[PDB]
Design a protein around this ligand. Structure first.
Ligand SMILES: [Zn+2]
Lengths: 200, 217
């Protein structure tokens, strides 16, 4: 019902996930592991995976983290007249800081001829995931007219990629000159700004 | 050889009705608890309903009240989820699962349920052209903007599947208009821009839409 919390870890690390319980006492638990694009998998624990109950809170422990363990974990609690899944913990691969390479794309002439305009800013292969994109139109800071999405952790170098799309009407696009996206990230000592002038 | 195959997912207007199916194989639903679990895009798992073995007693999440009905046909070996008075927040991938006495050890592939007032529309495909500013120290970035389609999903490939390295196909975003949009990008050597051709192959099954787009500098 909410976004999964994120946990950064390395191979060989020990990880303990706590199931946030309710009116438990008389409650039982089941743990699941889910990878992007696939159905969850039931976790059989006791041997790398172990579990126990400390009070009302169920815990799942990964003794020594393996690269196939990097996933999103859920606890399921079931009791009398109650069945629920916990929030979910996404265990992601920790790696060295990597700055994004930034690219900006003007609206294609094809889209403009079709009566609309989308400006795209691309952030390629960065770590950690946390990144802020700020759109500027004639040096006016924008907000509420752009949307972004992020890929899952790359299977190649454990980085992320982000694309931000600024949506404007064709008429409004053509009455401004300078379009820029400003990128803020861990790996950047100073914010990187990619820009273009309309019609160059 | 245990398998659960789901069906019935699709698009419906809010207030409408949908029946999902979960066909079992390698076992009969009569002998096991069968569960329905859903997952909204980007969100965690949410338990929806369950039906008991032998006697077929049921249980529902508070969020699906007396709107949803779970049942099973033991002769056809299929479990169902009747969904009435559907709301936008019911939009999710729905999974059916078998319980084994313990946890849900077998899951279906999931089926997508979209609840919205928007109507089915094929996407428009626009190029994200490479240039002198989409390049840097040898590598150039290019892609395709797949805009204004409904509902999910859209699939994108490059050069009919031959190009997979450096390919980033981002998750779709739901625009305020109610229509979806996504971008697929790929980074290539700048020197290949003159030689190699790059084509994004877009498929949008809900509208039977197939579109190719050659991306040129
Ligand atoms: Zn990549």
């Amino acid at each position: 019902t909410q976004s999964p919390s994120s946990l950064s870890a390395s191979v060989g690390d020990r990880v303990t996930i706590t199931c946030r319980a309710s009116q438990s006492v008389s409650s039982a638990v089941a743990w699941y592991q889910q990878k992007p694009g696939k159905a969850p998998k039931l976790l059989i624990y006791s041997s790398r995976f172990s579990g126990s109950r400390s009070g009302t809170d169920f815990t799942l422990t990964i003794s020594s983290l393996q690269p196939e363990d990097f996933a999103t974990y859920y606890c399921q609690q079931y009791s009398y007249s109650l069945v629920t899944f916990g929030q979910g913990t996404k265990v992601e691969i920790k790696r060295t800081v990597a700055a994004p390479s930034v690219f900006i794309f003007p609206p294609s002439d094809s889209q403009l001829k079709s009566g609309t305009a989308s400006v795209v800013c691309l952030l390629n292969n960065f770590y950690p995931r946390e990144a802020k994109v700020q759109w500027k139109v004639d040096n006016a800071l924008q907000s509420g007219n752009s949307q972004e999405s992020v890929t899952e952790q790359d299977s190649k170098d454990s980085t992320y990629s982000l694309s931000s799309t600024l949506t404007l009407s064709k008429a409004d696009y053509e009455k401004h000159k300078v379009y820029a996206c400003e990128v803020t990230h861990q790996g950047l000592s100073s914010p990187v700004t990619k820009s273009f002038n309309r019609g160059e | 050889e245990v398998q659960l195959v789901e069906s019935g997912g699709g698009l419906v207007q809010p207030g409408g009705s949908l029946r999902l199916s979960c066909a079992a194989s390698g076992f009969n639903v009569y002998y096991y608890y069968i569960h329905w679990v859903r997952q909204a895009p980007g969100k965690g798992l949410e338990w929806v309903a369950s039906i008991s073995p032998y006697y077929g007693y049921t249980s529902y999440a508070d969020s699906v009240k007396g709107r949803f009905t779970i049942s099973a046909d033991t002769s056809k070996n299929t479990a169902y989820l009747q969904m009435n008075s559907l709301r936008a927040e019911d939009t999710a991938v729905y999974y059916c699962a078998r319980w084994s006495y313990s946890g849900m050890d077998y899951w279906g592939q999931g089926t997508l349920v979209t609840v919205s007032s928007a109507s089915t529309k094929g996407p428009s495909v626009f190029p994200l052209a490479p240039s002198s500013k989409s390049t840097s120290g040898g590598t150039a970035a290019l892609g395709c903007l797949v805009k204004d389609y409904f509902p999910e999903p859209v699939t994108v490939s490059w050069n009919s599947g031959a190009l997979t390295s450096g390919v980033h196909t981002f998750p779709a975003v739901l625009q305020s208009s109610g229509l979806y949009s996504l971008s697929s990008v790929v980074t290539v050597p700048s020197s290949s821009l003159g030689t190699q051709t790059y084509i994004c192959n877009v498929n949008h099954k809900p509208s039977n839409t197939k579109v190719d787009k050659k991306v040129e500098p």
